[PDB]
RNA sequence: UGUACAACGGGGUAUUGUAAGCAGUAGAGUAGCCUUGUUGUUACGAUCUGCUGAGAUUAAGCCUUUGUUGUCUGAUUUGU
RNA sequence: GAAUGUUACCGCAAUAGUAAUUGAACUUAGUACGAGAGGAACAGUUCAUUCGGAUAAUUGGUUUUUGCGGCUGUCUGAUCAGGCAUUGCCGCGAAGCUACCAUCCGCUGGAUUAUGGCUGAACGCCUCUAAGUCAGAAUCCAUGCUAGAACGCGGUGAUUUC
RNA sequence: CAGUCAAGCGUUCAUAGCGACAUUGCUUUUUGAUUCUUCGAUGUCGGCUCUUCCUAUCAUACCGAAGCAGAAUUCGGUAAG
RNA sequence: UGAACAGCCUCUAGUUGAUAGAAUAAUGUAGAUAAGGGAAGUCGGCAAAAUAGAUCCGUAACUUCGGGAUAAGGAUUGGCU
RNA sequence: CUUAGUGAGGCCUCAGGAUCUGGGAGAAUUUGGACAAACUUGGUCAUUUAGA
RNA sequence: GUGGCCUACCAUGGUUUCAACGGGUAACGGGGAAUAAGGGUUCGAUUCCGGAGAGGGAGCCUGAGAAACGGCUACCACAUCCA
RNA sequence: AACUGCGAAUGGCUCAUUAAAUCAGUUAUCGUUUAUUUGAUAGUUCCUUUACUACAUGGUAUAACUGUGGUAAUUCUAGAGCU
């Protein structure tokens, strides 16, 4: 079960809903409900018709918080040195000096 | 579907075989470089918490950090692009892709631990596996030790040992 | 649907009326099917037999090379245009009405089916499964 | 005379697809006064943007309501 | 819808109407049969046709929701918001109605027909028939379904005082 | 449209399936013959629609027969659900 | 507005005369729209649908050389500056 | 050959910014172009050709 | 890089009976080949030179150099493997 | 193995288009691009210009590799750890 979603408006298409479109490129365009669908066949351009999910991502509308900060990082420092030269003599002779 | 964890800090890697929808679904319409805890996944993995790195779907694209969609797409691919490695010369190839955005068509989600879970994996925090090769530039060595340009490296040097039989070399 | 037809077929809505004018979807010459008779049709008394995904057809070609016009033969609706609806919940519909000659074990008469293809319709007539670039 | 009923008002749901107003370094451009401009200034210009997925409509056979106001004995008949 | 006290509620069932249809794919089985070529069927499964009764979650249709928006001509000085063009014109348009264009559902017992038989005389034999009797059909009667006799019926509640 | 006799057809074998000469019927969607009813008027082809009925059943149900190996067909019974 | 005494809207002038009220059944009369197909309907495309202004480009058979010809087939069209 | 219509794809360009560093890189994505295959429909030229 | 190569503005030019333009070519061009009085006629896909193509078109990446095809990309026509 | 460089634009094949095109002989670049080969060709690079700028030589990020994977299937390749 998988909720699809619109290709001329973006939004969610649950199961058993709206018009599915094969066009003759082979290429599928579902709509939700018969708006898009024929605002689809009136050759409108959804960057254009206000309500969209297209129109709004490409005017900046609403977004805000995506926008925000996040806090994903983490802290590692652990050693391995390296396969074939004993991983006990690469922490003592490790001990630096600058 | 199956989880290819990673666990970077030590160099291990293991997988883990997950049936159950729900368990699984905690990775739905999340994308590469996005974040899960552990709990969902697991009591084991309670904790953990995996940003999430690539992975194959069945028939085995790969996916592709930046497409968006939970689909395949057939793109244009160059030299320096991720799925594409180029035979020739200035050559793009037109090939599939699968989307950043996980779906259950996935055969493996490839991940990458971040944080530790109250508790140990086996595979993976217990065992710890070396860096293979060492510094080799000069002065690579002396940030790997942290030197001076004084010290002089040639002793600083990793000296590999492997035996003959009955002449053990280096 | 009928000789050579392995499968069966959940019923599909019927687009396709005896008269109907698909274009020829394969490598044989033809340009268009136009339909005369429906193989399995029924019965009532006005109603016109009628075609959907996947029913194997009676057609004349009206256009095409002329070894191929002036006679009857049968030909195979791959694509509807007509909305069906499948079982699970979806209504679906190609952009065109279109079908490929066959015989009537259901072969082709091309090497191949220009455009897409129906999965119902592919599911039904291995020949067509062949030939099919994308199926649905 | 009350988990009363109604008129509104509120909330939901749904339709359309961004209201009026005001603002703007958006605008092909255009006028006029000189203090003729090292953005000169005052306005005017289809359209554009912002406040604004706003505004408008939404039971007339949608849902819902602690709110507001009101309403609650007229008439006729019937017997083994 | 008057009249069998009034009124109300729950029911009974006379009589009557009645409904389901046909095809295929799998499988059986390349099987029995056949020198071969050829080549079935019963049980099982999946779908279909014709018909019928519903129904509106979806999809489609319909649009005076004159609901939103758009456009022409004009009239209100402009602005705002609007009038007229027998519903001006256009896109979208809920609700309702609605479509094998949409979706759901369409019951199972008995009795028999032809026909095959049992036992068995007539007629020391024989005979499905004479007596008696088994099996039997898209038939018939029921079950089921729709009316409910406005002069067929039952159970039950309350039954008026100035 | 259906019978009776059965000379013949059917390799053989009259009647599986047919059947001469003859002969017996039935039916009233043929066509005739008749002119009883209607000429102070029964609207007059075909189709559309839609109902119902008949059966001399094309299909579907279950059968008997075969010149029925099988598959196909054919003759026949109960049958107009 | 527009080619216009066309249609549509308006000033002047003149009307607001045509039983009424409540609903909005079947069937109608009049005005409309329908997915896919596209005359398969039917005596027959009956009816209805489609076309349509102008600027531009392009325009066949045949002809009494006058035509056939808006033949056919195309693109274009607001606003504002 | 070619009108008209539809128009792939790379290229140029307005944008875009998964990430990943030091104003820059940079994927999906997208605007506008030139180039333009190709499909549908017609026309045209050449060369063939069935036929009572 | 010269140049109507292309764009703007501008003029109205350019070719032709000394055959333009158009059609044909079972036409790649040349070195050459066959035929021996001479003049000629006929021929050259084909070993050397130039040119054009890589199934038909276009587009381009890389590059000193390709509009390359024993390179990519799109479409058209072919056509292969499959779970 | 892989990286890096160079080469894959030569060769070979065919004659389909092509009729002022190609090709030929003859010119032109005072009209431009050129890897290579060959010969030449480089004291200048920092900065308010004494408390100086790694020159005794400044940076990371990757292949191969290890190890974890995916697909019926290709000279498909993803996640992770190095240099
Ligand atoms: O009916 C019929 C007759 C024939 C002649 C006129 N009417
Ligand atoms: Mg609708
Ligand atoms: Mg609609
Ligand atoms: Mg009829
Ligand atoms: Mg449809
Ligand atoms: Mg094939
Ligand atoms: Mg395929
Ligand atoms: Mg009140
Ligand atoms: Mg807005
Ligand atoms: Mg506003
Ligand atoms: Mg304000
Ligand atoms: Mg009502
Ligand atoms: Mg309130
Ligand atoms: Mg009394
Ligand atoms: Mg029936
Ligand atoms: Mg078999
Ligand atoms: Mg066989
Ligand atoms: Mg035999
Ligand atoms: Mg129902
Ligand atoms: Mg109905
Ligand atoms: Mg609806
Ligand atoms: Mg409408
Ligand atoms: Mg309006
Ligand atoms: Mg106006
Ligand atoms: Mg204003
Ligand atoms: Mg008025
Ligand atoms: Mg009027
Ligand atoms: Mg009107
Ligand atoms: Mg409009
Ligand atoms: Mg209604
Ligand atoms: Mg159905
Ligand atoms: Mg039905
Ligand atoms: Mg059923
Ligand atoms: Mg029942
Ligand atoms: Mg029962
Ligand atoms: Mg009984
Ligand atoms: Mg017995
Ligand atoms: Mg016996
Ligand atoms: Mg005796
Ligand atoms: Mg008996
Ligand atoms: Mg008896
Ligand atoms: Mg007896
Ligand atoms: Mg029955
Ligand atoms: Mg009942
Ligand atoms: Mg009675
Ligand atoms: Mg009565
Ligand atoms: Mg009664
Ligand atoms: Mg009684
Ligand atoms: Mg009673
Ligand atoms: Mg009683
Ligand atoms: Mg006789
Ligand atoms: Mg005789
Ligand atoms: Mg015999
Ligand atoms: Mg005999
Ligand atoms: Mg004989
Ligand atoms: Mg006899
Ligand atoms: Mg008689
Ligand atoms: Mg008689
Ligand atoms: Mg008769
Ligand atoms: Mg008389
Ligand atoms: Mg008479
Ligand atoms: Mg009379
Ligand atoms: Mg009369
Ligand atoms: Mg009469
Ligand atoms: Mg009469
Ligand atoms: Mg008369
Ligand atoms: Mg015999
Ligand atoms: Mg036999
Ligand atoms: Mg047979
Ligand atoms: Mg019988
Ligand atoms: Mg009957
Ligand atoms: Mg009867
Ligand atoms: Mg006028
Ligand atoms: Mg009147
Ligand atoms: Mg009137
Ligand atoms: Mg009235
Ligand atoms: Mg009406
Ligand atoms: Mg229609
Ligand atoms: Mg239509
Ligand atoms: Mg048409
Ligand atoms: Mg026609
Ligand atoms: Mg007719
Ligand atoms: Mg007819
Ligand atoms: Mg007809
Ligand atoms: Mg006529
Ligand atoms: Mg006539
Ligand atoms: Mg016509
Ligand atoms: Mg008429
Ligand atoms: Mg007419
Ligand atoms: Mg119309
Ligand atoms: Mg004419
Ligand atoms: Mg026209
Ligand atoms: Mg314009
Ligand atoms: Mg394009
Ligand atoms: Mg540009
Ligand atoms: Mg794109
Ligand atoms: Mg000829
Ligand atoms: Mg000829
Ligand atoms: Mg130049
Ligand atoms: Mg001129
Ligand atoms: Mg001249
Ligand atoms: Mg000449
Ligand atoms: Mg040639
Ligand atoms: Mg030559
Ligand atoms: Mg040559
Ligand atoms: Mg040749
Ligand atoms: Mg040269
Ligand atoms: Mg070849
Ligand atoms: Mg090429
Ligand atoms: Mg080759
Ligand atoms: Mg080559
Ligand atoms: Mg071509
Ligand atoms: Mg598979
Ligand atoms: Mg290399
Ligand atoms: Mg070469
Ligand atoms: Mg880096």
Same mark, same amino acid.
């Given at each position: 079960?998988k ?5 001329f ?7 058993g809903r709206?018009t ?9 365009f579902?709509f939700?409900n018969s708006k898009?669908?024929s ?9 254009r018709?206000?309500?969209?999910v297209l129109?709004?991502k ?5 977004? #805000?918080?995506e926008?925000?900060?996040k806090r994903?990082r ?8 390296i #396969?074939?030269?004993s991983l006990?003599l690469?922490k003592?002779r490790?001990?630096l000096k600058? | ?8 800090? +030590? ?5 883990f ?8 679904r905690?990775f739905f319409?999340?994308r ?8 969902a ?6 904790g953990?918490v995996?940003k999430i ?6 028939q ?13 797409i057939?793109?244009?691919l ?5 799925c594409y ?9 037109r090939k ?14 490839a991940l990458?631990?971040?944080?530790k879970?109250?508790?140990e994996?086996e595979?993976? #925090?217990?065992?710890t596996v070396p860096?293979?090769?060492g510094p080799?530039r000069?002065?690579?060595?002396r940030?790997f030790?942290?030197?001076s340009?004084?010290?002089?490296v ?5 000296r590999?040992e492997?035996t003959?039989?009955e002449?053990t070399?280096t | ?6 499968? #069966?077929?959940?019923?599909?809505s019927?687009?396709?009326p005896?008269?109907?004018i ?7 010459g033809?340009?268009?099917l136009?339909?005369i008779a429906?193989?399995?049709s029924?019965?009532?008394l006005?109603?016109?037999p ?18 191929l016009r002036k ?7 791959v ?9 699970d919940g979806?209504?679906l519909?190609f952009?065109?009405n ?6 009537p074990?259901?072969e082709?008469k091309?090497?191949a089916?220009t455009?897409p293809?129906?999965k119902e319709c ?8 062949? +030939?099919?670039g994308?199926?649905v």
């Amino acid at each position: 079960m998988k909720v699809e979603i619109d290709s001329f408006s973006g939004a969610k298409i649950y199961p058993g809903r709206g018009t599915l479109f094969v066009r003759g490129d082979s290429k599928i365009f579902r709509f939700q409900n018969s708006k898009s669908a024929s605002l689809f066949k009136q050759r409108k351009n959804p960057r254009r018709i206000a309500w969209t999910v297209l129109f709004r991502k490409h005017h900046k509308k609403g977004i #805000t918080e995506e926008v925000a900060k996040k806090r994903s990082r983490k802290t590692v420092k652990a050693q391995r040195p390296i #396969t074939g030269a004993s991983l006990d003599l690469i922490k003592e002779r490790r001990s630096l000096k600058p | 579907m199956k989880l290819n964890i990673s666990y970077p800090v +030590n160099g291990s890697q293991k997988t883990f075989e997950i049936d159950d929808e729900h368990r699984i679904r905690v990775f739905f319409d999340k994308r590469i470089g996005q974040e899960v805890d552990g709990e969902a996944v697991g009591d084991e993995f309670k904790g953990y918490v995996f940003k999430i790195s690539g992975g194959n779907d069945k028939q085995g694209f790969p996916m592709k950090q930046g497409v968006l969609l939970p689909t395949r797409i057939k793109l244009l691919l160059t030299k320096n692009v991720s799925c594409y490695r180029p035979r020739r010369d200035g050559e793009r190839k037109r090939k599939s892709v699968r989307g950043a955005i996980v779906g259950p068509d996935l055969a493996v989600l490839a991940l990458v631990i971040v944080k530790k879970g109250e508790q140990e994996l086996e595979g993976l #925090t217990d065992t710890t596996v070396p860096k293979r090769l060492g510094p080799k530039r000069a002065n690579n060595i002396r940030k790997f030790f942290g030197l001076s340009k004084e010290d002089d490296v040639r002793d600083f040097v990793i000296r590999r040992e492997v035996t003959k039989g009955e002449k053990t070399y280096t | 649907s009928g000789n050579g037809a392995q499968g #069966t077929k959940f019923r599909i809505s019927l687009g396709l009326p005896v008269g109907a004018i698909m274009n020829c979807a394969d490598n044989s010459g033809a340009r268009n099917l136009y339909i005369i008779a429906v193989k399995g049709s029924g019965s009532r008394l006005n109603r016109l037999p009628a075609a959907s995904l996947g029913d194997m057809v009676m057609a004349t070609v009206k256009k095409g090379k002329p070894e191929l016009r002036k006679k009857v033969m049968p030909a195979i609706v791959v694509r509807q245009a007509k909305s069906w609806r499948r079982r699970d919940g979806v209504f679906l519909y190609f952009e065109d009405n279109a079908g490929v000659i066959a015989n009537p074990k259901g072969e082709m008469k091309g090497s191949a089916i220009t455009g897409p293809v129906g999965k119902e319709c592919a599911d039904l007539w291995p020949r067509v499964a062949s +030939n099919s670039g994308v199926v649905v």
